[PDB]
Amino acid sequence: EHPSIRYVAHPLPEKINEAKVSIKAYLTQHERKRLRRNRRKMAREAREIKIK
RNA sequence: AUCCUUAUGCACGGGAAAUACGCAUAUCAGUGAGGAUUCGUCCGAGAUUGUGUUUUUGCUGGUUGAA
């Protein structure tokens, strides 16, 4: 009686606090190139405007 | 702390080319694009279509003429 034979326990499964390591999203070479092209282009444009 | 590898970002410098370099509310693409081959197999990343410039873009200097 003091420990019941009848019941089956389903105790709370303790979830471990997994540290969210934000994933290093990489770039394709092409993507990188595009980025380089665009930022640089923008800079150039700015220079032109700020020199014209 | 010193030395080195990789990638990238910024730049000195040097070189080549622009028939080249993009762009896309496109279509498809390592769940295979496109290729090789001694035929056993092998390489493996763009291809298609559309389109913008492309004997050139942006800026300077000179002589000159113009008169």
UniProtKB/Swiss-Prot annotation:
Membrane-spanning parts: none
Places the protein is found: Nucleus
Known partners and oligomeric status: Component of the U4/U6-U5 tri-snRNP complex composed of the U4, U6 and U5 snRNAs and at least PRP3, PRP4, PRP6, PRP8, PRP18, PRP31, PRP38, SNU13, SNU23, SNU66, SNU114, SPP381, SMB1, SMD1, SMD2, SMD3, SMX2, SMX3, LSM2, LSM3, LSM4, LSM5, LSM6, LSM7, LSM8, BRR2 and DIB1.
Additional comment: Present with 432 molecules/cell in log phase SD medium.
Function: Participates in pre-mRNA splicing. Part of the U4/U5/U6 tri-snRNP complex, one of the building blocks of the spliceosome.
Protein name, as recorded: U4/U6 small nuclear ribonucleoprotein PRP3
Source organism of the structure: Saccharomyces cerevisiae (strain ATCC 204508 / S288c)
